Design an enzyme around this catalytic site. Structure first.
Site, PDB file in Angstrom:
ATOM      1  N   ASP A  17       1.156  -1.104   0.277  1.00  0.00           N
ATOM      2  CA  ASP A  17       0.559  -0.159   0.067  1.00  0.00           C
ATOM      3  C   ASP A  17       0.866   1.276  -0.174  1.00  0.00           C
ATOM      4  O   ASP A  17       1.438   1.821   0.755  1.00  0.00           O
ATOM      5  CB  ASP A  17      -1.077  -0.445   1.310  1.00  0.00           C
ATOM      6  CG  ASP A  17      -2.364   0.636   0.875  1.00  0.00           C
ATOM      7  OD1 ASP A  17      -2.270   1.778   0.397  1.00  0.00           O
ATOM      8  OD2 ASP A  17      -3.536   0.654   1.510  1.00  0.00           O
TER       9      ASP A  17
ATOM     10  N   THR B 157      -6.867   3.781  -2.486  1.00  0.00           N
ATOM     11  CA  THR B 157      -7.040   2.324  -2.253  1.00  0.00           C
ATOM     12  C   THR B 157      -8.166   1.908  -2.523  1.00  0.00           C
ATOM     13  O   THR B 157      -8.243   0.171  -3.421  1.00  0.00           O
ATOM     14  CB  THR B 157      -6.617   2.124  -0.907  1.00  0.00           C
ATOM     15  OG1 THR B 157      -5.341   2.499  -0.294  1.00  0.00           O
ATOM     16  CG2 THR B 157      -7.214   0.438   0.308  1.00  0.00           C
TER      17      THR B 157
ATOM     18  N   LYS C  10      -6.538  -3.867   6.680  1.00  0.00           N
ATOM     19  CA  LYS C  10      -7.704  -3.273   5.735  1.00  0.00           C
ATOM     20  C   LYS C  10      -9.105  -3.792   5.217  1.00  0.00           C
ATOM     21  O   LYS C  10      -8.801  -4.687   4.614  1.00  0.00           O
ATOM     22  CB  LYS C  10      -7.541  -2.026   4.748  1.00  0.00           C
ATOM     23  CG  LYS C  10      -6.497  -0.840   5.545  1.00  0.00           C
ATOM     24  CD  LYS C  10      -6.332  -0.357   4.039  1.00  0.00           C
ATOM     25  CE  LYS C  10      -4.757   1.269   3.998  1.00  0.00           C
ATOM     26  NZ  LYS C  10      -4.578   1.933   3.288  1.00  0.00           N
TER      27      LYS C  10
HETATM   28 ZN   LIG Z   1      -3.396   2.194  -0.620  1.00  0.00          ZN
HETATM   29 ZN   LIG Z   2      -3.530   6.012   1.988  1.00  0.00          ZN
END
Ligand SMILES: [Zn+2]
Ligand SMILES: [Zn+2]
Ligand SMILES: [Zn+2]
Ligand SMILES: [Zn+2]
Length: 520
Positions: free
Chosen positions: A15, A56, A139
């Site tokens: 990420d 994201t 997440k």
């Molecule tokens: Zn991300």
């Molecule tokens: Zn971010």
């Protein structure tokens, strides 16, 4: 007479990993992590994200669907839904229950907002759903969306308990192997000794000084500097703190190893699919910025964890029997304070409140703008009708006002993208990112280097510019020759490539094409 296929394919998306993280820290990496992928696999050094915004939820969706928000329906981490009359979180689903936790906000999630199938969906369709498909991330969005609509499981981190959980969309109860993993309290073990740099801090010459004005705080410490000695005490009080440490990545990869064993991933000839998002590089990057010692240490520690991860694959699956692709859902800009310190073009982008006051003065009605997000503005259709106002009038005024802003490069109506006087690749990226039902009425493109003012420290990501859209893309293992390329490719080319390697049908909304030079 069987189709040649790997026993397992692993989709790793780091990420917020800018492409140049591979080379800024190249001299400090070990031989078994990023350098193993470079030295034995195929690296595409000119891959860009072909939509906006570069956030994201879309990044993970587009990596695994080969599609764009206009088609697959994931128009951001959040979007304003004008029929629901409110902002919507990408995975929120109040028709399911939490599994493994009692928190509804943490556990009520599903992939139901995703309209197109994933490559993980297509693998299940191609194997009569005998394939094991498991998504792992801290997440929810980064675990659920890559895993598709019918995986074996999708697990994400519960900030209230320190456990990995799921929802009744997937199973009625947590599997034994998840309960077993959670009961180890791996998070407590990881943060027990605080956070010091892996190398002597004086050696982090690729980073700025430790104490700089543009870096945010971590836990209880009141300066953005090592050592973070109160981590264990801070994690106890707020278990979400581990997300903003390198140990969030270590935790995720140990959970992924537990998934391989708990589901017997890669032991027989039926291809299994493991998706894992490494989220801590994003949390750390958001707080400290790409030039911080914190971020550099996160990548040196992630590099070692990947080496351990690949070595575990060699023993549990076998070298040559698995396929790995590593990429990112987006990059990140440099911090505004960092760029100002070095005289680079930069700046900051309360538009809804400020513009509504002006729209109020101009047209006489309040709350004409319903939402302002993802560099778009939505107009409240209820207010326009009751106030007898035209969408085009109200839209033309806002666009005229936004052209005056020093941070604004382009403003345009999402009804008139194709004819706008905007160069490629920006124009097509705006088209690809525009979802008719879920995107706004105006699209805004900011000048280079400008960031949101939402947080004046750390950094963020959402724009078309190369620092946000230039992502690493590395292939390694079964069916992959070694090499590298500077030919231009898109993020939407990843899923078609895996589909061709696996001889499975492309995802349903795919617009990309296979990267033919990788398939060797
Ligand atoms: Zn991300
Ligand atoms: Zn971010
Ligand atoms: Zn620092
Ligand atoms: Zn299998």
């Amino acid at each position: 007479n069987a189709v040649p296929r790997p026993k397992l394919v692993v989709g790793l998306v780091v990420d917020q990993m800018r492409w140049d993280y591979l080379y800024r820290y190249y001299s400090k990496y070990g031989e078994g992590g990023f350098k193993r992928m470079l030295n034995t696999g195929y690296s595409l050094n000119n891959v860009h994200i072909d939509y906006v915004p570069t956030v994201t939820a879309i990044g993970h969706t587009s990596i695994f669907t080969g599609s764009v928000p206009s088609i697959h329906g994931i128009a951001g981490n959040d979007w304003y839904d004008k029929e629901l009359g409110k902002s919507v979180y990408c995975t929120s689903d109040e028709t399911v229950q939490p599994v493994g936790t009692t928190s509804n906000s943490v556990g009520q999630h599903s992939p139901r907002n995703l309209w197109s199938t994933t490559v993980t969906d297509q693998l299940g369709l191609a194997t009569n759903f005998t394939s094991k498909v498991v998504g792992v991330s801290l997440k929810d969005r980064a675990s659920i969306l890559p895993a598709g609509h019918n995986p074996t499981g999708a697990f994400w981190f519960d900030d209230t308990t320190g456990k990995f959980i799921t929802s009744t969309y997937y199973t009625k109860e947590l599997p034994k192997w998840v309960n077993d993993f959670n009961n180890k309290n791996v998070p407590a073990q990881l943060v027990a000794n605080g956070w010091n740099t892996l190398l002597p801090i004086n050696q982090y010459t690729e980073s700025s000084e430790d104490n700089v004005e543009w870096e945010g705080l971590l836990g209880s410490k009141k300066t953005p500097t090592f050592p973070y000695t109160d981590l264990a005490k801070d994690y106890e009080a707020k278990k979400g703190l581990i997300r903003t440490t390198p140990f969030g990545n270590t935790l995720t990869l140990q959970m992924a190893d537990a998934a391989i064993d708990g589901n017997q991933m890669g032991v027989d000839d039926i291809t299994d699919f493991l998706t894992v998002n490494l989220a801590s590089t994003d949390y750390v990057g958001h707080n400290f910025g790409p030039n911080s010692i914190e971020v550099e240490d996160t990548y040196l520690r992630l590099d070692r964890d990947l080496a351990d991860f690949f070595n575990n694959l060699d023993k549990k699956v076998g070298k040559g029997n698995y396929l790995v692709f590593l990429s990112a859902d987006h990059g990140a800009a440099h911090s505004v304070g960092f760029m100002q310190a070095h005289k680079m073009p930069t700046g900051f982008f309360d538009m809804k409140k400020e513009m509504n006051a002006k729209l109020k003065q101009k047209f006489g009605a309040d709350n004409i703008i319903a939402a302002a997000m993802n560099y778009q503005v939505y107009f409240d259709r209820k207010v326009l009708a009751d106030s007898k106002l035209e969408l085009d009038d109200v839209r033309d005024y806002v666009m005229t006002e936004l052209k005056k802003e020093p941070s604004v490069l382009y403003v345009l109506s999402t009804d008139e993208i194709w004819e706008s006087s905007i160069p490629e690749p920006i124009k097509s990226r705006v088209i690809n990112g525009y979802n008719w039902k879920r995107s706004g009425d105006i699209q805004i493109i900011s000048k280079d280097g400008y960031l949101s003012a939402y947080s004046k420290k750390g950094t963020t990501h959402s724009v078309w510019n190369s620092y946000d859209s230039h992502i690493p893309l590395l292939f390694m293992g079964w069916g992959i020759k070694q090499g590298e390329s500077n030919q231009p490719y898109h993020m939407t080319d990843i899923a078609p490539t895996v589909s061709s390697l696996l001889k499975i049908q492309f995802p349903s909304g795919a617009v990309g094409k296979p990267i033919t030079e990788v398939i060797g």
